[PDB]
Amino acid sequence: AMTMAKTLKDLQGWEIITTDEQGNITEHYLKRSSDGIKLGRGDSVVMHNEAAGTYSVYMIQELRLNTLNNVVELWALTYLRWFEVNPLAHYRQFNPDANILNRPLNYYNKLFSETANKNELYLTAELAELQLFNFIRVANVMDGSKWEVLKGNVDPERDFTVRYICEPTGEKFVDINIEDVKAYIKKVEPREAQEYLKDLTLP
Amino acid sequence: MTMAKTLKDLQGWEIITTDEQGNITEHYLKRSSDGIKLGRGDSVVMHNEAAGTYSVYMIQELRLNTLNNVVELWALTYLRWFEVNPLAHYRQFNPDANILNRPLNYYNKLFSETANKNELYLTAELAELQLFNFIRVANVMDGSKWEVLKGNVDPERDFTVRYICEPTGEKFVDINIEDVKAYIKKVEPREAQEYLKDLTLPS
Ligand SMILES: [Mn+2]
Ligand SMILES: [Mn+2]
Ligand SMILES: [Mn+2]
């Protein structure tokens, strides 16, 4: 018998659970045997981003299954973290000083990095392929109102708030109801959902 | 402040911005150490740790953040032979063959044994690449040039492309990789991507 070499990662045993329009036994979702964690469209996740030397957060948008060999591809909408926001572009849209006054740019860079909610994410329609071996934890993303309520009890590594969707460049913000984006993502087809989201920030 | 470096920092990739011709607008990346130059249209061999082997892409956009010089390298994903759907491929190029013998296995074995392992298949699916995973510039040519270079190919640098297809390795449409290359560095990134994407869709 061919004894296949394994790695610790193989102990987790991510399982592909397929279901029908509502029940079980099509729509797929991933379940980790070791702890029961389940991932599917609409779920936001904290992933290790080695290129950034820190974590990145995404909203799973598609579990692509290759029926010929069970190879799975996890695709997700990319959120931007505070340091990916274009401060000036942001203030020109929400701070009258940016358009009325002529303050030096550094003024807005310092102001943003000093006042921005570091746990406020910005949804973008830009898809990225994720690898399960980089999974950190399920993210708890909520809108501004819930955030106000939870403010005093936030787990800075799991809880985040989203009020806008914007271009990957961190500009052109559009108010959104993240909870509804989530419901919408797991309801309509992948390409249709992403395209709708992509058009929200362009004329 | 003494900044901590890694060997990667010795390569020093440089950002070069030029007009629609040259000078000091479009961007290119140049590695100071060996002079390697990368820009839209260029196909590249990258290490793919998720795949445990290399992957090939065609750079489609060099995104620059002029606020901090952080660059994002986006590229069209090529599929390698082992990512093609044997059935669909067989079924599309040889077929009008009323039958299918021992499906999966006969097709997987047949394709892998008759396919040009150095034939890539373009897809309009974008992926963000990291320079620290760059291996070498790929030499992707059309079918005619490949026959000429046939007996003198470098297995890890020389590739031939004749089709664009869906990321799932099906629905192959004839394309001229050289023409795609000229087109990519000529029109807007999104415009180019969207065009390539529709090439395999009903319309
Ligand atoms: Mn980005
Ligand atoms: Mn790695
Ligand atoms: Mn793929």
UniProtKB/Swiss-Prot annotation, chain B:
Domain BAH, residue spans: 36-176
Subcellular location(s) per record: Nucleus
UniProt record similarity statement: Belongs to the ORC1 family.
Function of the molecule: Component of the origin recognition complex (ORC) that binds origins of replication. It has a role in both chromosomal replication and mating type transcriptional silencing. Binds to the ARS consensus sequence (ACS) of origins of replication.
Subunit structure: Component of the origin recognition complex (ORC) composed of at least ORC1, ORC2, ORC3, ORC4, ORC5 and ORC6. Interacts with MCM10 and TAH11.
Comment, domains: The N-terminus is dedicated to mating-type repression.
Miscellaneous note of the record: Present with 3930 molecules/cell in log phase SD medium.
Protein known as: Origin recognition complex subunit 1
Source organism of this protein record: Saccharomyces cerevisiae (strain ATCC 204508 / S288c) (Baker's yeast)
Residues of the full protein shown: 1 to 215 of 914
